[PDB]
Request: fold
Amino acid sequence: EVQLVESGGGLVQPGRSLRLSCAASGFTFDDYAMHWVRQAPGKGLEWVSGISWNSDSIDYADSVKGRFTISRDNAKNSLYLQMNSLRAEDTALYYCAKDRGYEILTPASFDYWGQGTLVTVSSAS
Amino acid sequence: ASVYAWNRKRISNCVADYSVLYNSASFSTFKCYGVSPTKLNDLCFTNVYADSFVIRGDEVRQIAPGQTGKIADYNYKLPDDFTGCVIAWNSNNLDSKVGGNYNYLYRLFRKSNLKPFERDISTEIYQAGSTPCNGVEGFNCYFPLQSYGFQPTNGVGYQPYRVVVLSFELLHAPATVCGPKKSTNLVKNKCVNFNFNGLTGTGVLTESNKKFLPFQQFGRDIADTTDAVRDPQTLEILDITPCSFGGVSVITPGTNTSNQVAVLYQDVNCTEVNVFQ
Amino acid sequence: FQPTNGVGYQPYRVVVLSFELLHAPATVCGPKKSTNLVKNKCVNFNFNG
Amino acid sequence: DIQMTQSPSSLSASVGDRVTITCRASQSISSYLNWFQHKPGKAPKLLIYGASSLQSGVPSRFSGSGSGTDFTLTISSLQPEDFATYYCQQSYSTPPYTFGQGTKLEIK
Amino acid sequence: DIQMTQSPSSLSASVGDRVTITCRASQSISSYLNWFQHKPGKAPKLLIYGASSLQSGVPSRFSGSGSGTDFTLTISSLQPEDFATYYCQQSYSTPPYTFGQGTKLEIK
Amino acid sequence: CVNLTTRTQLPPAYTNSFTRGVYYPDKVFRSSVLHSTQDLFLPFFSNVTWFHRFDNPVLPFNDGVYFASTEKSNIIRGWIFGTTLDSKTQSLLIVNNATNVVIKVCEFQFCNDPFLGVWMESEFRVYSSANNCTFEYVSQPFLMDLENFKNLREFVFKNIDGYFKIYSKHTPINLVRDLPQGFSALEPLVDLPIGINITRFQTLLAWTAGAAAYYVGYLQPRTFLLKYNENGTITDAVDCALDPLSETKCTLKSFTVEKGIYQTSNFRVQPTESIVRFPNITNLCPFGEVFNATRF
Ligand SMILES: *[C@@H]1O[C@H](CO)[C@@H](O[C@@H]2O[C@H](CO)[C@@H](O)[C@H](O)[C@H]2NC(C)=O)[C@H](O)[C@H]1NC(C)=O
Ligand SMILES: *[C@@H]1O[C@H](CO)[C@@H](O[C@@H]2O[C@H](CO)[C@@H](O)[C@H](O)[C@H]2NC(C)=O)[C@H](O)[C@H]1NC(C)=O
Ligand SMILES: *[C@@H]1O[C@H](CO)[C@@H](O)[C@H](O)[C@H]1NC(C)=O
Ligand SMILES: *[C@@H]1O[C@H](CO)[C@@H](O)[C@H](O)[C@H]1NC(C)=O
Ligand SMILES: *[C@@H]1O[C@H](CO)[C@@H](O)[C@H](O)[C@H]1NC(C)=O
Ligand SMILES: *[C@@H]1O[C@H](CO)[C@@H](O)[C@H](O)[C@H]1NC(C)=O
Ligand SMILES: *[C@@H]1O[C@H](CO)[C@@H](O)[C@H](O)[C@H]1NC(C)=O
Ligand SMILES: *[C@@H]1O[C@H](CO)[C@@H](O)[C@H](O)[C@H]1NC(C)=O
Ligand SMILES: *[C@@H]1O[C@H](CO)[C@@H](O)[C@H](O)[C@H]1NC(C)=O
Reply:
């Protein structure tokens, strides 16, 4: 019954930045943790980043450290993800998942997901 | 919430159904003092208290009347005449962090044991010695609050647990937390088996204008015998009179002489039960 | 005994304390201070426990 | 680092068959495993959180089991709406939320 | 797949000596190990089923121990009827009944 | 806020409480019986502090307050209960203004002289700020006029088991500067289900100064023997530890006693202090050797 719709997928050159959003409407956004998940076109799921119920504890994956800055806006039930200095391996599909608890690193799993937004890092026409 | 800042929720105006609570299997500890859990449905209570907090695994036993311990003495105290139920379940999936969840605090030192059912919020620096602290922590200046090191790798006996205790209070007030029981139509002037908000008993409900009873419900006698009760559905003063008593004395001649008897019910006007008065 | 044994099979060191109380002079007391002695005054005395 | 492994690679069954998908963890994770059903056409869903706890909203046909370094997932019937890829995720070790590889299930 | 390993290769002792044969499992098997004495001239026999449970019909001189990924077998005396090859078998993982290599014991 | 200093310094007076401050201790109906109960009561013939001029300082709240007032224009509006009364702790507020009865448990910012100004009432300067509000309650609509004594109002406030209990009674009187000698039973009014910590309190007043006074008394745990008439109302009571005759009446469970000698209780001398006598040995028990050993 919850809805999670993202945006910001497109075509960019290597080293260029683009901005993601994700709208939540089916639950209370002010007391849950949120995560970002990456799905390569020819591989499995991979965890990227997560934020707590409030902007206190933030963790990043090893391969995306120093490049991504996950934000949050509790006022209008919307989170963000700023990706900087994109490389060719970051042309995967990104999901906007929801955590069952209120913290980032907990034995709690990801209960609800949303349809991803595909991004490409290449120089095409 | 934390131990020293335990929440308390007021419960009133309920059709309280405890069957769903009983049938759930998510509670490791399900213990009730003075009330059978299967019998919670019919009983009516004037008010219900729900206290929630999180403590350590080894301290689940300390939440009981007449129990001694650091949390038992300095954080949370139960009356010796406590009645109700205690609910607790593990919360590693919610209240555990690999780096250690430091959002849970409990009190270490205090001047003296606190009275049952009272809360402490002051975070003044404890004076363990003679050196004045003057708001500066140091020697003979211990912070009374300590943070639990809850981690998913920790032992089972040390794991965080969430505790919710239900306390039921009964007194001469109109009960507002009842169970899913249907109220039937009233029948008076006959020997019936009534039930007025858990007040069980038999008798005849004659209509009596005992007094005004502007705010009162029950009426008592020399013994613990409810004489008059006030109806819960409407507002009238009914009167309870117990059924007929007596004795069966047998008038007989010698069985050697003949085989006949005559029964006597004394102190019985047996227009209702060769009849004599 | 080996370090590779299971948790239930590990060695355990046991120390048991037993106290006896009877009509004998108490000799093992606790760290309780002793006050002065007052005579001809109704008091709550504590003589050797 | 912890390595999370998938024993099966591709399985095939029938509408009235019964197969078991197993997932092995290199290091002990203490019953902290999750199973996800990723339909390739839409967003993935969750079936079982924890070792053997079944989330509300999905049929009780699925059943999980295992603890320590050995886990298993089974489907009792493989109904015509169960063709998807299943992933096993651990949430106990320092590398956060390591996912296992896929396991395609095409019934034929 | 699970790999089952034997630390010793060949041992030698005396009639009044005491040696220990150890068997390591790559993955945890939870105390489900078995030891067999395979005399090269006839059918093999079983000595200890489970981690430390001794089967009826063989002397109580033998004693086993271990759980998880570390196991050990010891012989207290090595009497003149104990020269044989000893195998450790796991019965917990999906590959059914994986046997370890041999361990020859010639007393001299 | 607004400071008023035109207040002459007068020491508080005192008056005899007589037999005032008896209420119904519970909600069960009894008739034509003598019932003995233990409860927080106002002792018979106690000392009651008398205030007048505008006199309304902060007063303590130990276990209960017997508040009585005789007026002609109802200068008193309500009461304020709390511990700090400076938004540092939760405080209780009651105002029975010209509109209705308003009760709030919010955290207010009380100045050094909370009061109401006034024929019409215009100045509402009891508090300045209010935050973290929790509870509120308003009674039924009723309007009351702003303009020797004729009526006496008496109240009892209790705070136990997280309940704020208020008992009240209103009776006519022909006295001016004296409390009536008689008996009056107080029935419960409201039982607020709020668990506040209360230690001090104060009274509100509503420029022109009026001629009125209010009386303050403190309750303490006492045993009482109450007499119910044929209609279930309290007609007389006996403070059971006022004097030996009262103890005799308690023992016999009656209000009349015949000539004779009766045994009431037992006299027992109480201890004055305590003494401890232990041998002066200072060597420690060898517990380290038992526990910190290498080989058992
Ligand atoms: C009313 O009186 C109070 C107290 O007498 C005044 O509060 C004082 O304000 C001064 C500001 O110059 C402070 O230095 C004092 O510490 C305050 N005293 C207390 C007890 O708080 C208040 O200012 C006066 N208000 C008016 C309008 O005269
Ligand atoms: C010998 O025993 C004593 C007390 O029985 C131990 O002393 C305490 O040990 C704890 C835990 O290590 C410390 O927190 C205390 O500060 C110690 N107190 C004192 C006064 O030393 C001591 O540790 C034991 N010895 C060994 C080697 O364990
Ligand atoms: C419901 O209870 C109230 C309580 O006074 C009563 O006034 C009312 O008549 C009751 N309604 C019915 C349908 O019994
Ligand atoms: C009692 O019974 C005996 C025989 O059973 C008889 O002989 C005797 O007369 C009887 N006496 C009376 C008083 O009935
Ligand atoms: C018995 O009851 C009848 C009618 O109910 C009455 O007339 C009679 O007086 C009663 N007996 C006594 C002894 O009161
Ligand atoms: C009240 O106390 C005052 C001061 O001690 C005293 O003068 C007065 O007599 C007392 N009143 C009564 C009734 O005891
Ligand atoms: C309520 O209390 C919190 C702190 O407990 C405070 O930050 C907040 O400002 C208060 N509410 C209002 C309206 O002031
Ligand atoms: C009420 O507040 C006072 C502060 O004046 C404090 O001393 C007391 O302990 C508090 N009551 C309780 C039950 O904590
Ligand atoms: C009880 O009330 C009635 C009025 O109905 C009155 O006549 C009677 O005197 C009252 N009882 C007493 C003892 O005053």
